[PDB]
């Protein structure tokens, strides 16, 4: 039934400065010569309080997909700090990697991300306004969350 199956996601360049682009090595399997494109997205949760502060870092259309095992590195630019509420800038947040077929999301891989200052003085006495040039992004890559959804694969 499910034409596409995500086998693995590897977090590359981690930890890294806040401004470095995200890099995930994704491996997936395709059952047939999939008729429509697969739409991969990297979504950054800018604020746990509201979905309005989500930033879609990149949206990619992969296809035609021939039947078989495939692997690619999904790279996406770091979020725009100008849209992140200061209260949510430092500490834990989530980055999501989703895939969508025919406008239906079928997989969501989430990673908890902890943004922290690297200097001891800044860790103990954080600036009034976050300094994204001094933040390090530490993705909690040993604990990924995978959620699969039932979609209509028929054409």
């Amino acid at each position: 039934m499910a034409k596409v199956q995500v086998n693995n996601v590897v977090v590359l360049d981690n930890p890294s400065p806040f401004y470095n682009p995200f890099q995930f090595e994704i491996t997936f399997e395709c059952i047939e010569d999939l008729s429509e494109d697969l739409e991969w997205k990297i979504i950054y949760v800018g604020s746990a309080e509201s979905e309005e502060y989500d930033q879609v870092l990149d949206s990619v259309l992969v296809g035609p997909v021939p039947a078989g095992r495939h692997m690619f590195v999904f790279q996406a630019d770091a979020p725009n700090p100008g849209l992140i509420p200061d209260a949510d800038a430092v500490g834990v947040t989530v980055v999501l990697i989703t895939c969508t077929y025919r406008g239906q999301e079928f997989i969501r891989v989430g990673y908890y991300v902890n943004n922290e200052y690297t200097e001891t003085e800044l860790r103990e006495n954080p600036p009034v306004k976050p300094d994204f040039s001094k933040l390090q992004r530490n993705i909690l890559a040993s604990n990924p969350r995978v959620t699969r959804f039932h979609i209509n694969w028929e054409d």
């Binding site: 949510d88 947040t93 989530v94 989430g110 969350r145």
Partner: peptide, 11 residues
């Protein structure tokens, strides 16, 4: 409440 909200987002 931040952890509960973030957990709902991943689900």
């Amino acid at each position: 409440e931040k952890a509960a909200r973030l957990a709902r987002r991943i689900a």
